[PDB]
A paper describes a structure:
We show that the FdlA-NTD adopts a right-handed parallel β-helix fold, and possesses a substrate binding site composed of a long groove and a unique alkaline pocket. Our structural, biochemical, and enzymological analyses strongly suggest that FdlA-NTD utilizes catalytic residues different from other β-helix polysaccharide lyases, potentially representing a novel polysaccharide lyase family. Here, we report crystal structures and enzymological characterization of wild type (WT) and eight single mutants of the catalytic N-terminal domain (NTD) of FdlA, revealing its unique substrate binding pocket and identifying the key catalytic residues.
We first measured the enzymatic activity of 12 mutants and found that eight of them (D137A, K141A, H176A, F179A, E236A, R240A, Y242A, and Y242F) almost completely abolished their activities, H279A mutant retained approximately 65% of the activity compared with WT, while mutations of Asn243, Arg272, and Tyr322 to Ala only negligibly affect their activities. Mutation of Y242A resulted in a large structural change at the potential active site, with a 3 Å shift of Asn243, which narrows the substrate groove in the mutant structure. In addition, both glycosidic O atoms between −1 and +1 subsites and the carboxyl group at +1 subsite are hydrogen bonded with Tyr242, implying the essential role of Tyr242 for FdlA-NTD catalysis. Tyr242 in the substrate binding groove is located at the edge of the alkaline pocket. This arrangement, together with our observation that the pocket is able to accommodate a trisaccharide unit, strongly suggests that Tyr242 directly participates in cleaving the substrate to produce trisaccharides, and the alkaline pocket assists in orientating the polysaccharide substrate into a position close to Tyr242.
Numbering used by the authors: 1 to 442
The structure:
């Protein structure tokens, strides 16, 4: 009942068919610039457009090598290597690697998942080729950039009930590793997600070289010269819900926020954010995850984070995004450091909003002197200095349960009120808020 094909040329017709069971024979397949043309195999982008429904595609032992020059062969248009438009499709075990580091002419997304009830399982994806690469988002991630960009993202989850399962996503590109736009009930489960880091001091050492950052005198889009002392990711989000977007389901174009995301048992390493879902609506659930060396650990806005862990070497494990945050319930383990501490944010957590139930657990005995649990106050975060992103800093906290089962100190700012604090040690808790309760525990 399974059709096996032995070339990308013979694969493509099946992508336009419904109810097919297709296997691409074990082997290596190469997509290079010569392969993209009007009379060539890849006439249009997306390269692999899964338009059919109710189909299964097996890519076991398939290595698909896509030369990044392909990202420049479609004019000034977005290039997507893989897009699923149908429903009830299963794609499994493909190994996809972006070859070379050539930047996209405009922008690129390796995999885009529209439709409903699709699953991508067991993929191994390596993302390469973007501009600028080496600065993170310091000189622009959207419009009005200090340095113009050609972003390359990895997996874009849209549609309805679409599922990313047991995948490895390695990024060496300036883009989100895994993100959700206009997605209803997306689920990310069992995935390993990894980017790479670079200190702002290393960036600043480009002074005099004529680098692109050197030529703008390191003036960031946040309004100030790039500060030393921070560790940045070269990628954007690890698992992120975008603000708003467009998806396609059953020939219906839909503009909406992401809603009801679920993230289960994922390890995220060296991204801008471990798991950030504050922009998603509906029920948010994050369970069993590990976040290592990210600039921020967990920021889902509201919902549940349970049985999760983050280390604190490069940024806070937990951040309330806005003062409008409400009903954030979290049980987070501060993991032992995966590398030396280089956390310029001067906080292991920033807590604000109202009606939160927060538990922090750790075995760490050696606490860096700048690391503190903050309830309200002026976070020294890289992107919120000197009034930048003002809704994400300097906001009040009210009616919050804080169970500090850690040796980390707690600072309650004067904008904090009705904070119920239990801690291993209350001697390192400073309270300048209103009607805060502070009880020690064994």
């Amino acid at each position: 009942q399974t059709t096996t094909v032995y070339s990308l040329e013979d694969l493509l017709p099946y992508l336009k068919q419904d109810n097919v069971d297709v296997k691409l024979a074990p082997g290596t397949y190469n997509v290079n610039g010569f392969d993209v043309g009007e009379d060539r195999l890849f006439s249009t982008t997306p390269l692999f457009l899964f338009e059919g429904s109710n189909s299964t595609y097996d890519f076991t032992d398939v290595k698909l090598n896509i030369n990044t020059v392909v990202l420049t062969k479609f004019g000034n248009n977005e290039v997507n290597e893989i897009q699923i438009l149908g429903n009830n499709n299963v794609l499994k075990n493909l190994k996809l690697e972006d070859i070379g580091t050539t930047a996209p002419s405009n922008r690129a997304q390796s995999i885009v998942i529209d439709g409903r009830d699709n699953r991508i399982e067991g993929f191994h994806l390596t993302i390469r080729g973007s501009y600028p690469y080496g600065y993170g988002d310091a000189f622009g991630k959207g419009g009005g950039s200090v340095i113009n960009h050609r972003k390359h993202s990895g997996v874009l989850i849209r549609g309805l009930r679409n599922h990313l399962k047991d995948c490895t996503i390695i990024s060496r590109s300036y883009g989100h590793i895994v993100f959700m736009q206009a997605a209803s009930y997306p689920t990310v489960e069992g995935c390993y997600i990894e980017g790479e880091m670079r200190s702002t001091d290393d960036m600043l050492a480009e002074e005099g070289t004529g680098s692109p950052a050197d030529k703008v005198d390191f003036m960031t889009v946040w309004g100030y010269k790039l500060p030393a002392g921070y560790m940045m990711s070269l990628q954007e989000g690890g698992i992120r819900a975008a603000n708003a977007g467009t998806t396609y389901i059953d020939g219906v174009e839909i503009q909406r926020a992401t809603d009801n995301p679920t993230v289960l048992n994922c390890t995220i390493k060296n991204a801008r954010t471990g798991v950030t879902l504050a922009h998603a609506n509906g029920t948010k659930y994050v369970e069993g995850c590990t976040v290592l060396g990210c600039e921020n650990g967990y920021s889902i806005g509201s919902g549940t984070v349970v049985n999760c862990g983050a280390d604190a070497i490069y940024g806070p494990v937990f951040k309330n995004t806005y003062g409008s945050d409400k009903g954030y319930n979290a049980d987070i383990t501060i993991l032992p450091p995966s590398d030396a501490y280089y956390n310029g944010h001067d906080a292991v957590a920033y807590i604000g909003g109202s009606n939160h139930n927060l538990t922090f657990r750790s075995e760490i005995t050696e606490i860096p002197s700048n690391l503190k649990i903050m309830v309200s106050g002026d976070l020294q975060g890289l992107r919120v200095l000197h009034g930048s992103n003002p809704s994400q800093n300097n906001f009040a906290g009210t009616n919050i349960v804080l169970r500090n089962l850690t040796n980390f100190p707690v600072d309650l700012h004067s904008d904090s009120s009705n904070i119920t604090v239990t801690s291993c040690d209350t001697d390192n808790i400073t309270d300048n808020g209103t009607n805060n309760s502070i009880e020690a525990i064994d």
